[PDB]
């Protein structure tokens, strides 16, 4: 043995592993395994949870009357708020499952691991001699999970207001959010869909342009994909013919001819847009909401002339007025 620990460090850092367990991996793999196992068990068999701390248990597990679409892992109780609630903080598991214990165990483990997952996306790139910044692109979806699972609860003062772990539970998070923050009328969110729409747009753009400008090397009755071999020297598509077409679709100078300038834009646009949408949730976590144009335009006498912004407000009221029925005792919703 050259040195146990020295060998250990060499195995971890080894680039010859089927899955690169890195130094970040040493933290990632255990945390992610704890998160997923607890999730899977919860989603199936967990008992109803008193999310709003008003002794009104919400069942979100399969065995308790739910399906995939409705089922979810319910956030910790509102009676707990931002308090740390590990298993060893409960008199029993029965109590722990009642107060939304699993939720914290999952989100904490996930966010931790998902962060290390980003750290690993650097490490492997380092060990392979390639440029970093791939992890920087992954920082945008991660910052959203952080905003949705941690930042918003911190701001609002309770983990019960963090996004639930389920399909329908996610819809609830949105509808309520819109009511209290008017997110559709917020620039950061708008920039978000801009990146997301644009993303899907550009993804289809590039995708189509490239695959349409492929050099012929296949038969008429043979898959056009086989005209490429893993580990080629030259390019498999005519980027000059691609630019020629798209350059005529709009106009030359509004078309890319530099593959590197292309793929940068392909990466920059969605990442930056999602970055803002992540900052949107994080900003509206401190109640800096979207534009309020309610009763803006009024006539010469003073009568209120409605706009679409007002029609939006009515829909918002309905959500506000109806959400969390028995949770409110006082006029203003300040929590």
């Amino acid at each position: 043995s050259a040195n146990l620990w020295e060998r250990f460090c060499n195995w971890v850092t080894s680039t010859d592993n089927r899955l690169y367990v890195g130094w970040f991996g040493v933290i990632m793999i255990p945390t992610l395994l704890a998160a997923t196992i607890c999730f899977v068990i919860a989603f199936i068999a967990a008992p109803p949870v008193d999310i709003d701390g008003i002794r009104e248990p919400v069942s979100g597990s399969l065995l308790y009357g739910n399906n995939i679409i409705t089922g979810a892992v319910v956030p910790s109780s509102n009676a707990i708020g931002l308090h740390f609630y590990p298993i060893w903080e409960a008199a029993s598991l029965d109590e722990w499952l009642y107060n939304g214990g699993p939720y914290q165990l999952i989100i904490f483990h996930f966010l931790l691991g998902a962060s290390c997952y980003m750290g690993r996306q650097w490490e492997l790139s380092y060990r392979l001699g390639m440029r970093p910044w791939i992890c920087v692109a992954y920082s945008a979806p991660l910052a959203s999970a952080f905003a949705v699972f941690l930042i918003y609860p911190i701001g609002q003062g309770s983990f019960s207001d963090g996004m639930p772990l389920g399909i329908s539970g996610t819809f609830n998070f949105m509808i309520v959010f819109q009511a209290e923050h008017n997110i559709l009328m917020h620039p950061f969110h708008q920039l978000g869909v801009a990146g997301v729409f644009g993303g899907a747009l550009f993804c289809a753009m590039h995708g189509s342009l490239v695959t349409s400008s492929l050099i012929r090397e296949t038969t008429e009755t043979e898959s056009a994909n086989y005209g490429y071999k893993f580990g080629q020297e030259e390019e498999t598509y005519n980027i000059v013919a691609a630019h020629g077409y798209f350059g005529r679709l709009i106009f030359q100078y509004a078309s890319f001819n530099n593959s590197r300038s292309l793929h940068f834009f392909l990466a920059a646009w969605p990442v930056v847009g999602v970055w803002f949408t992540a900052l949107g949730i994080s900003t509206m976590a401190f109640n800096l909401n979207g534009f309020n144009f309610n009763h803006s335009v009024i006539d010469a006498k003073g009568n209120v002339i409605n706009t679409w912004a007002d029609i939006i407000n009515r829909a918002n009221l309905g959500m506000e007025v109806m959400h969390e029925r028995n949770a409110h005792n006082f006029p203003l919703d300040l929590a």
Partner: protein, 447 residues
Amino acid sequence: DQESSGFAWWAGNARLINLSGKLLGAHVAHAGLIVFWAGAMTLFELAHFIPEKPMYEQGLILIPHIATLGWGVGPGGEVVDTFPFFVVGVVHLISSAVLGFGGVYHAIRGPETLEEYSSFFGYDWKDKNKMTTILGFHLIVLGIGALLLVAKAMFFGGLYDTWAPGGGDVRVITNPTLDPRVIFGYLLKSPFGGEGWIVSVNNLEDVVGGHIWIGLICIAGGIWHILTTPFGWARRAFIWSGEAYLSYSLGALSMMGFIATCFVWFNNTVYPSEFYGPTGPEASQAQAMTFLIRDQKLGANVGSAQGPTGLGKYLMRSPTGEIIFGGETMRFWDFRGPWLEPLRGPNGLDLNKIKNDIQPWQERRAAEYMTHAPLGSLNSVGGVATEINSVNFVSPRSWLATSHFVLAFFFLVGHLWHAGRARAAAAGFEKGIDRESEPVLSMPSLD
């Protein structure tokens, strides 16, 4: 001297990585912009400042910073003399011209490099001795500054204490907590609900005291780095380059940016609700107070009142048994505040004090903070997203917290970016994979 044959235009400032002279001009011209803002903004705030009106209702974020240091304020945060505000503003604004001068000078007139025009000021990124030395210099400068606060608090006037015995007022701290067990105890505090870590500071004694420790420790480490070099591990662990050092400081600011966000949002002491707005929990607490006060005057027995869920309309229990406010405000049972504390007992809110020790100044305080919760829109319309235009207001606590989170976040990205490049720059592939010697092609197939 420097053009396209170094970096691209949109990466221009990276051409100055090895131009100590000009790279000094930037930092000095930049530092002027910071002083310029602080100065010009203070005067802007003062020019709009209305004395007989709450500061948080006027979009102030610098004048309340001055107020905290015990300047121009008195009993209950009452603004007495606006001259210290005017001074702090104009003095800064002036110093910006001085710094701006040197900045411009060092960047377009003075020596483009320093190493020759002065071996003392000239430096080498890989010179672990010069780096730890320059670091040692700033570690002292920051250290004295930490004592500059201690001096103002203990000698030159004091600070605004909201927890003041006779009610919020400027008080001279003459008993700083120097007990390390207490001081460094904060660092060992949880960051979750209840135990609030650094943000949980609730008295100026600790604030002043803590700063004494920091001031000394900083200068102490300042001297240490002057008279030493990085050890063995310290050298075999870090990356030594101009970019690497930047990255280290970038993540540092990012972390501090997040801590500041939680500070202005949660802390009551070093961020007085008299100058800033009421904190998030404070406002929700106030509503429970207000209507507990109201309905009780209508003849309601708050102690035994049963709400819709059967939990306790006005008063309920915390998970550990303490008597707290009812409703959704159950999440903010960790709130502490001058106006609310005299109603608190050894087991939480005392039903007897609640029943007949409610003071008028508390009722209108609760009403004030309730109708000034940190809720607002981007276009500054106070209230819930469904409110109507009338009250133009957004709590300063909201502005600061959101602004400094965006900055903190992007700086964490700035960190990753510059740290990722530095690792690739050092090892030498930050510009592409070597066509000839492609590392991956030399590794066995995992398939």
